[PDB]
Amino acid sequence: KRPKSNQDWWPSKLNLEILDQNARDVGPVEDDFDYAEEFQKLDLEAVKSDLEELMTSSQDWWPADYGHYGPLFIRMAWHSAGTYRTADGRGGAAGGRQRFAPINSWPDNANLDKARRLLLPIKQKYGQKISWADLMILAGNVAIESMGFKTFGYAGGREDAFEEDKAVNWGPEDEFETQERFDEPGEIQEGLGASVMGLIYVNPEGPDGNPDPEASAKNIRQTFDRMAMNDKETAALIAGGHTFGKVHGADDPEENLGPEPEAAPIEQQGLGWQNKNGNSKGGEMITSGIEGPWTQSPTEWDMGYINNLLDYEWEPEKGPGGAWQWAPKSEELKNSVPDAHDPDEKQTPMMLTTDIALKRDPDYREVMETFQENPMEFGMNFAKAWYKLTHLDMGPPERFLGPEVPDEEMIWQDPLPDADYDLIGDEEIAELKEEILDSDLSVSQLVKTAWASASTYRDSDKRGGANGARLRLEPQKNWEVNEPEQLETVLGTLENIQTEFNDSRSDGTQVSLADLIVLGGNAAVEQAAANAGYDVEIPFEPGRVDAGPEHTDAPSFDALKPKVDGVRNYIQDDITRPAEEVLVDNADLLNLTASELTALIGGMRSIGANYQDTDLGVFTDEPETLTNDFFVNLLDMGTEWEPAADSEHRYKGLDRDTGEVKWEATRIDLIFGSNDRLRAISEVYGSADAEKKLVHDFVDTWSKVMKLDRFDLE
Amino acid sequence: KRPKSNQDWWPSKLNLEILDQNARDVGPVEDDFDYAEEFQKLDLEAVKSDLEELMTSSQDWWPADYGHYGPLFIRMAWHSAGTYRTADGRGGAAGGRQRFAPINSWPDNANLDKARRLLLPIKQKYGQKISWADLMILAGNVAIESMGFKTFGYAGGREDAFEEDKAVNWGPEDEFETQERFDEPGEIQEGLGASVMGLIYVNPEGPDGNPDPEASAKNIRQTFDRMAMNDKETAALIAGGHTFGKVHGADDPEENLGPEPEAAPIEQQGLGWQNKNKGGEMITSGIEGPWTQSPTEWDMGYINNLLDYEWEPEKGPGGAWQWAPKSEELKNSVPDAHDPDEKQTPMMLTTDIALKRDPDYREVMETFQENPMEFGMNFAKAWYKLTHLDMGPPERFLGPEVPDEEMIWQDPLPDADYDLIGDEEIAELKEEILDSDLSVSQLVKTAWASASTYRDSDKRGGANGARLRLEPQKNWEVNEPEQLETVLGTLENIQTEFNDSRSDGTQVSLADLIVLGGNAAVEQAAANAGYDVEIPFEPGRVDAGPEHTDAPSFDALKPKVDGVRNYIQDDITRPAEEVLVDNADLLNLTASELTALIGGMRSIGANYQDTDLGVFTDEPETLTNDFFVNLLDMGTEWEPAADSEHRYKGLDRDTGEVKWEATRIDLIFGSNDRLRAISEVYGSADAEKKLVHDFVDTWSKVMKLDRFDLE
Numbered sequence A: 001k002r003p004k005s006n007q008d009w010w011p012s013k014l015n016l017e018i019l020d021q022n023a024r025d026v027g028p029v030e031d032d033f034d035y036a037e038e039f040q041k042l043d044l045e046a047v048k049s050d051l052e053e054l055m056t057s058s059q060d061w062w063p064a065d066y067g068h069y070g071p072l073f074i075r076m077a078w079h080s081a082g083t084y085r086t087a088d089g090r091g092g093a094a095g096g097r098q099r100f101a102p103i104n105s106w107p108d109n110a111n112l113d114k115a116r117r118l119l120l121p122i123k124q125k126y127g128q129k130i131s132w133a134d135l136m137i138l139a140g141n142v143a144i145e146s147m148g149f150k151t152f153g154y155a156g157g158r159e160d161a162f163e164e165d166k167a168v169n170w171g172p173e174d175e176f177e178t179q180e181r182f183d184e185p186g187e188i189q190e191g192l193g194a195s196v197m198g199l200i201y202v203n204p205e206g207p208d209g210n211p212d213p214e215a216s217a218k219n220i221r222q223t224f225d226r227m228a229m230n231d232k233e234t235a236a237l238i239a240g241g242h243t244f245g246k247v248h249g250a251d252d253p254e255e256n257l258g259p260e261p262e263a264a265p266i267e268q269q270g271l272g273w274q275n276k277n278g279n280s281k282g283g284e285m286i287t288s289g290i291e292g293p294w295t296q297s298p299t300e301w302d303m304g305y306i307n308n309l310l311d312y313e314w315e316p317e318k319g320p321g322g323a324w325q326w327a328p329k330s331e332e333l334k335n336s337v338p339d340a341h342d343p344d345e346k347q348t349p350m351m352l353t354t355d356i357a358l359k360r361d362p363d364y365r366e367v368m369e370t371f372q373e374n375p376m377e378f379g380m381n382f383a384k385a386w387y388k389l390t391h392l393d394m395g396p397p398e399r400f401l402g403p404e405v406p407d408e409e410m411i412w413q414d415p416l417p418d419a420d421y422d423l424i425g426d427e428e429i430a431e432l433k434e435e436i437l438d439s440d441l442s443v444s445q446l447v448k449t450a451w452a453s454a455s456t457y458r459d460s461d462k463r464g465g466a467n468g469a470r471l472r473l474e475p476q477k478n479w480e481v482n483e484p485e486q487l488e489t490v491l492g493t494l495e496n497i498q499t500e501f502n503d504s505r506s507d508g509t510q511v512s513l514a515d516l517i518v519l520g521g522n523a524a525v526e527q528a529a530a531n532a533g534y535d536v537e538i539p540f541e542p543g544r545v546d547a548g549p550e551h552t553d554a555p556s557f558d559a560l561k562p563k564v565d566g567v568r569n570y571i572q573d574d575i576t577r578p579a580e581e582v583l584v585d586n587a588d589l590l591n592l593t594a595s596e597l598t599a600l601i602g603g604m605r606s607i608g609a610n611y612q613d614t615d616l617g618v619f620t621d622e623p624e625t626l627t628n629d630f631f632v633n634l635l636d637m638g639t640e641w642e643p644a645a646d647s648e649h650r651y652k653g654l655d656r657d658t659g660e661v662k663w664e665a666t667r668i669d670l671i672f673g674s675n676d677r678l679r680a681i682s683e684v685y686g687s688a689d690a691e692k693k694l695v696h697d698f699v700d701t702w703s704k705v706m707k708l709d710r711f712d713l714e
Numbered sequence B: 001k002r003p004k005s006n007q008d009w010w011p012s013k014l015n016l017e018i019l020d021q022n023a024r025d026v027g028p029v030e031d032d033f034d035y036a037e038e039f040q041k042l043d044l045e046a047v048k049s050d051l052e053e054l055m056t057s058s059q060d061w062w063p064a065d066y067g068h069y070g071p072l073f074i075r076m077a078w079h080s081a082g083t084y085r086t087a088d089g090r091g092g093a094a095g096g097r098q099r100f101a102p103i104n105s106w107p108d109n110a111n112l113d114k115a116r117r118l119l120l121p122i123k124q125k126y127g128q129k130i131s132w133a134d135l136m137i138l139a140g141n142v143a144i145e146s147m148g149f150k151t152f153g154y155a156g157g158r159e160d161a162f163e164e165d166k167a168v169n170w171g172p173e174d175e176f177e178t179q180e181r182f183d184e185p186g187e188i189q190e191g192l193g194a195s196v197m198g199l200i201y202v203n204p205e206g207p208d209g210n211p212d213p214e215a216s217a218k219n220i221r222q223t224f225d226r227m228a229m230n231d232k233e234t235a236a237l238i239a240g241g242h243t244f245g246k247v248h249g250a251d252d253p254e255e256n257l258g259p260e261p262e263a264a265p266i267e268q269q270g271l272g273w274q275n276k277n278k279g280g281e282m283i284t285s286g287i288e289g290p291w292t293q294s295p296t297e298w299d300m301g302y303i304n305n306l307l308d309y310e311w312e313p314e315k316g317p318g319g320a321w322q323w324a325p326k327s328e329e330l331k332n333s334v335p336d337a338h339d340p341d342e343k344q345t346p347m348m349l350t351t352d353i354a355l356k357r358d359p360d361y362r363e364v365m366e367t368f369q370e371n372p373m374e375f376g377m378n379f380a381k382a383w384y385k386l387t388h389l390d391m392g393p394p395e396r397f398l399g400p401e402v403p404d405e406e407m408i409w410q411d412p413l414p415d416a417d418y419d420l421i422g423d424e425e426i427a428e429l430k431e432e433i434l435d436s437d438l439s440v441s442q443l444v445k446t447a448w449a450s451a452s453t454y455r456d457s458d459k460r461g462g463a464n465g466a467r468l469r470l471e472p473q474k475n476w477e478v479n480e481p482e483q484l485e486t487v488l489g490t491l492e493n494i495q496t497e498f499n500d501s502r503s504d505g506t507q508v509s510l511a512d513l514i515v516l517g518g519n520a521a522v523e524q525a526a527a528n529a530g531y532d533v534e535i536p537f538e539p540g541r542v543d544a545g546p547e548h549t550d551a552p553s554f555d556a557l558k559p560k561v562d563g564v565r566n567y568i569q570d571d572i573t574r575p576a577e578e579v580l581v582d583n584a585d586l587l588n589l590t591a592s593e594l595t596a597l598i599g600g601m602r603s604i605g606a607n608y609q610d611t612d613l614g615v616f617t618d619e620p621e622t623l624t625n626d627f628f629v630n631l632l633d634m635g636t637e638w639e640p641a642a643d644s645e646h647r648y649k650g651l652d653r654d655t656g657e658v659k660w661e662a663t664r665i666d667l668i669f670g671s672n673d674r675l676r677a678i679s680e681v682y683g684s685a686d687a688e689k690k691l692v693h694d695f696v697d698t699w700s701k702v703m704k705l706d707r708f709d710l711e
Ligand code: HEM
Pocket: A065, A071, A072, A074, A075, A078, A201, A202, A203, A204, A220, A237, A238, A240, A241, A242, A244, A245, A246, A247, A248, A249, A286, A287, A288, A289, A290, A354, A386
C-alpha cells in the first residue's frame, strides 16, 4: 500500500514540508538556469503565429467547437490565473501549477487537460525558451486577438514550477464541489478566494446549487474582491469572457465522465474525464454539465453577450446535463446559433445563474447598462482587466519581459521610481554606517526597523519588501505591529542623516531612506556580532529607491499585514491557527528553510528586537550580543516550562528545582524546543562549538531577506 | 486549518516525496561536511569517560533505577538498532531516526525520550564530533561495560539524519499496538520486521495479547530472522539484554500516561508519556518487575531464574500479562529499584518463557547455562552485529575500537595485492572490450546487473567485489544466468590475457572490467547519436570470493522489479511503478535522475530477454531522447494488451496499427503529473544533448555508489 504519513498519525503536526520546498528546486533544470535570459532569445511573433494556426487546426481526439479552439484557450487561461488570492498572494498563473494536482483535477478544470495537451507541440518546439506558464497565458491572448479583439499587452517571465505549491490551503472541505465556508452569500471564510472547494470563484448554478441570482452576486462580488477585482473589472471580465464560446453538458457528467486525471488509468496518459463512448464526439461533449452558447457568434468579439443578457427576459430551467441554467422566454432567440459541431443544426442561447446575477444585482446592472451604451468603454475595461488578471502575480515592472509589454506601468505592479542621482560608493557606505550607529538609535531599534521594512515581501506574488521604503507610507506606517509612534522616531532620525548626507555632497550623489533603513539594520547586526567577538561584513546592495503615495495603492497593501511576526515575537490576539503554524506559513513567503528560520529566530532573540520591547524568548543576560544563548538556554533541562496563568500567549520558564521564574516566552520561541525536527536543528546550534556557525547562518539569512525584492540580478 | 495533501485526495498517487528526499539534505550542516573526518577528531575515550560518569548521575526528572541508568541505555540502543529489516535494509540505528516521528512516539519507545534527553549534555559538549546515532549506540556499549561485560568492539561513522525516512512502510495498520499482518504466528506478511504496528519485534505479552509462549516463539523466530538473526543470536540477545534492568508498569499506561511526544503539549519540550497521577511509580510498558536478583550486574541470573524455576502467568499491576515464580525461593529476592531497603519478586515476560518452552530455543538456553563463556561470546558478537548491521562494508567502520576481525555480515572485501591500471591501460582495455563480440546492450545490461544491487539504506551491494559472478546473483532470474555467463566468460578471458601480459605487477579486476565495459558501451551509444562523452572511471574495485560472501544474505537484495531492464516479477502485489520508485530511492535517485535513466536507457535497449518493451526508437543502441518524443506523441493512443498482465499497446490513433509495446514502468512517465513535466523537458526539440548528459551523469553516479573513498 502506502508508507503512510506522520500527518495521518498526528493531524496537528507542524507542516514543515512547506519549508522543505524552499531547500531545493525539483525538476531537471540546472542550478544556473536563467529563464529571463532564455525567453529573451524567443521569437514571440513566431510562437504567436503558431498559436494562431493552432486555433483552427482541429484534432480528432477533441474537435474544436465552431472550428475554433480560441474560447477553450481563453477558459484555460482564465482558470490558470483565476486561482489567485490576495490574502497570501498564492494561486495564480505564475508557475503554471494548473498542470499539477490538485488543481489539474478540480471539477472546474474539467477538460482543460485536453486544452493544455493541444499546446504540447508548440511547447516542445520552443523548449526552454517559453514556459508552460507563459504559453498558457499567451494562448489566451492569441485566441482573443484572433477573434477580433486586440489585447492591452503581454509580458513573459513566468518560470515553470515542477510540483504543486504545498503551502496553499484551498479550504476545509473534504470533498470537491462541496462548501463548508459560508452560511450566507458574501460571508465566505476569510483567506479563501472561492466559495466552493474545487471551483475557481463561485458555483455557476448559484449558491449551494440554488438558482438565486441575487445571492449569487454576493459571492461573485466577494470572491472577485479577494482576487483583487472591483465591480467594474468583474463585470468586464465575465461579460468579455462569456462573449466567446459555450458551456458543455450533453448529459450528466456524474454518470458520463470517467475519473479526473489524478484518478484515471495509466493508459490515459495524464488526461481524464474520459467520456463514456465519445471523447471525440463533439456533439456529446460534457464538461460542466451545463449546455449552450451565450451568443449568436461564439467565435467573434461583439456585444452579443451583453445584448442577449439585457435585452431579453430569462427563466431558470433544467438543462440536458441536469444542471440549472437559464433560457429565453421569446422565440426571437430560438435556434439563433449554429451547432458547435453539426452544420445542419442550430441551438438556442443560454445564461448561467452567475450571468443573470450581473443583471439582477443593482450595482452590476448599472455597469452592464453603461457597457451596452458604450461598447468602446466595455472594450477598454475588458482589455485592462484581462491584462491585470493574467499579470497581477508577476511582481514589479522589472519582471515583465518581452516586446509586448505596455509602456504604461499599472498601479497593481507597485512600481518604483528611478533614482535621479548618483549611487553611493564604498567610502560613503562606511561613513553612513558609522553615522547611523553613532546616533541615538539602538541596535534593537535598527534591526526592528529594517525587519519591518523587508519582512513584507512574499515570494508568492513578488509583492512587498524593503525597496521603495513603503514602510514610511500608509498603511504600513500605522500598522500596530510596526509600533507607529516608535517607527516615527526611528524614521525621523534616519531622515535627518539622509538630509545631512545629501547636503554635504558636491557631486550629485544622494542616498534614499530605503537604503539607509537596510544599511542601518546591517550595521546593527554587524555591531551585535562584534559585541560577541565576531567580525562579520554583510554584503550591501545600494540602489533602493523611495516610492511615493501617488504610486502606492494603500488599501491593497493591507493584505501584507502580518498576524504573527516571529522576529518581533508579535502575535495578533485573534488568530485562529496556533501561532507556530502562522510562523511557518509566513516563513514560506520569505523562501526560508526550517534551518534558516531556526537560525533567524534564535539569533534574533540574542539581539532582542521584540514588539513593545518585551523579554519574551530573550534567553540571554547580554541583549544586543549575537550568540547562541537562545539555544543553550532553551535546551537546558534545568528549566521547566508551563503556560502562564491569566495569559493568552505567554509561558514561564521556571528553575526546575527552586521554582524561580527564569524566563518568559511564547509558542514562537518554544516550538524550536518541542517539534522533533526543529529540536534537532536547535541542538546543533546549541552545541559547545557552534556559536560561530550560528552567527554566520543568522547573518546569511538576514542578508537573504533584506535582498528578496532586489530583482536587479535576474 | 492545514492544506489537504494530494495523497489524501488520491490515496493511490505515486509517492514521489521519497525521491525528493534525495534531492536535498535538510538540516543546517554544511554542504561540504565530512562526518568521518569530524569523528576522527573525537577523543572517544573522553566521551566514554563522560558516559560512565552519567550512568550513576541520577536526574530528578527521571530518577535512575538501582542508581544506574545502564539498563535504560541498553534498551535505548536495542530499540535504535532493532527496527532494521533485511528486506529493504531500512530501519536501524544508522541515522538516529528514533529521534523523529513516527518512531519517537511508538508505544515500544515509551520513556526513551527521557533516555535520549539524559544524553543531551554530552551531545552538546562534543558537538559535530559525535552524532546522536553514534552516541546512542556508544551509551549502550558503555552501559554494558560498566556493568561488568566486555563488548566485542565499537565503530563510529553513523551520520545523523534530520528527518524521518519517508520510504519505510511500517505496515498496514491504522492504529498503534494492533496487528493486521499475521493470521498464524510465524506467518507474518512479507517485508515487515515486526508482528505488531509500533513494536520493535513482537508483543511482550504474547501473540494477539494471549500469554502463549510456544506461539510467541514462532513470531520471535520469524521477526529476528527478518532482522538477520538466527536462533543462537536471538537467544543470546534476549537473555543478554534481560540480564539487566526491569520492566515498568506501576499502573495501566492506557489511563495513566499522557500523550506520546508528537501529541504532547508544547511545554513538554519534546518529551511525552507524562505520568498523570516519575521513579517509584514509573510506567513504560505496563508490565512490572526485574528479571534478575542483581539488575545492574552481568551474571547468569536471567538464564538461571528462567530455567531453574517454574513460572505461571498472571495479570500484573499494570494490567498486562507477566509471569511469576511458583516457588517462594524467589519472593522478595531483588532490591526495589528506588529503595534498597525494600525488596521485589522477579518476573518473566511471555517472550522470555518462549525461550524455555520452544524446543529449539530451550536447547540453546541449556547450552548457554552450562557454558557461561559460550553465552557471553554469543551475546557479545550478536550485540556488535545488531548495532552495526546497517553500516556497510569495513571501510565505513571508524575509530580505535573497531575490532581487527572483520565479520561476514560486513560483506568484507579483499585487498588489491597489485598495482592499479592507469589511463593508458584503461584505454587499452576499453578498446579490447569494444573489439570483442559483446554488444552495447550486453555490456550495459551486465554493468547494471552489477551496480544496481546497491542500497543506500544499509550500504550493501553495488559493483565492488563483482559478486554478480557468485552465488546467488549469478543465478537470479532477472540476471538471465545463461546470457550472463556468456558475458562474464568473455570479460574473464580479457582479464586473463591482460594480467598475463603484464610484468610491472599491474593487474585488473573483473569488477573493474564490468564497469569499464558498461562505460565504454554508453560512450559508444552516445557517439552513435553524435555526442562525444567521456565518463569518469574510478579503478580500484576488487574481486570478492565466496569466502567474503554470505550468499543467503544476498537474497534480500534480489529485485522484484527492475526499471532499467523492464523486468517485472509475476507475483508482486504493488503496482510496478510503486516498486520502481521504492527501488530508485535505494539508489539515491531523484525523480529527474530516474526519468533521465529510464528514458535514456530505452533508447539504448537493455531489456530483460531483449524485448522491445518501452523501446520507442527506430535505432536502438543509440543514446537519444526518442523515448520521450515518442511517448508524448498524441498521434499514438495507448491501451492495455488483451490477455496480458503487464503489457500495454501503443496504437496509431488514425489506423489502429500497433506502433509500440510497453509496461507500466514506461508509461508512468507519461501519466504521473510530475513525471510528465520532466518528460516534457527531455522530449523538447533542443533537449537531446541535456538528456544525454543527464543520463551519463546518473549512470556514472550509480556505478560509483559503493565506492566509499572519494567524497
Ligand atoms: C462568476 C465567474 C464565472 C463563472 C461562474 C464562470 C463559468 C463557466 C462555466 C460553468 C463554463 C463552461 C465550462 C464548460 O462546460 O465547458 C465556462 C466557460 C467559459 N468561461 Fe466562464 N465563468 C466565470 C468567469 C469567466 C471569466 C472571468 C472569463 C474570461 C475573461 C471566462 C471565460 C469563459 C470562456 C471563454 C468560456 C467558454 C469555454 C469554451 O467554449 O470551451 N469566464 N464558464
